[PDB]
Amino acid sequence: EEKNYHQPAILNSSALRQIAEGTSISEMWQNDLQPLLIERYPGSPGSYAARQHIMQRIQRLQADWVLEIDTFLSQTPYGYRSFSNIISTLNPTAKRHLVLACHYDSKYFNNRVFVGATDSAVPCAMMLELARALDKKLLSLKDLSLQLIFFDGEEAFLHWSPQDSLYGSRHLAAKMASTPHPPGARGTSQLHGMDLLVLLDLIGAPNPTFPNFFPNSARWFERLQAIEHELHELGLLKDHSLEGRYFQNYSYGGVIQDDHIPFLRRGVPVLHLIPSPFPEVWHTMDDNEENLDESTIDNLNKILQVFVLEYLHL
């Protein structure tokens, strides 16, 4: 309905510089990102500490985020285990929400530990830094708002299959599909109030190239392209080339499995910020803090924060 005709309020140069300046890559690194770089596969003590970190960093902000933990047991190749997706919503009774999402588990695995630095500590920390950098503007919103989702159990425990993967997202898309929205309404569920799902995944590697995956989000991907482009021209990006842009005029010809899968196949539009090709380090012990690129991530935070403000008209 409205989602289909919704237009961004495009911000001027002055307002661009403000967004570029009001985000801190170093704050994100030390306060949002470093505490997540721990083994945190589903049900582990590392999972719990990560969950606690996420909630804590969320609670500390004046915007009136409403947190909710969707916990549940699912059969795994290692028997029943516990999962906990984390939902942070502003204005939970607002009809429409822009949704941001990462998976916050790490994949269960040299006498080294897998910490999924791109996969996906960085996407989560970016979500966190967005919530902090925009706090004051998000505070004003207190019938479209913002939701953050951190999915648990994205990864296969053993071998990626329909039943061994995406435990978090598949359980939550279904919860949301059978839950009336707004509360005490008839016919319409919580998925239906999902304007757009923007899934960040595998972000942090140098020189990422993000395809335009879905016609029904193509105009939103376009907005990312114009945004990168304008932040670039204003000298607000770092180590940034037009020839090496993140957001390319490229469509993708395969199907990627990820947390958007159970929302997409129920008709939620998806803007899938996963690069192709996948980072050199993907599903290797090398996916660590060392192999991450500061300026890339700093840059994408600014593209992303602008995208978000424009969508919310903020």
Ligand SMILES: *[C@@H]1O[C@H](CO)[C@@H](O[C@@H]2O[C@H](CO)[C@@H](O)[C@H](O)[C@H]2NC(C)=O)[C@H](O)[C@H]1NC(C)=O
């Ligand atoms: C570009 O956009 C910004 C939006 O932030 C404009 O600044 C606003 O100007 C109006 C008009 O007086 C004020 O009500 C707001 O208080 C201003 N906002 C802020 C955050 O300062 C800015 O004037 C616009 N500039 C141009 C050249 O178009």
Ligand SMILES: [Cl-]
């Ligand atoms: Cl465990």
Ligand SMILES: [Zn+2]
């Ligand atoms: Zn992965």
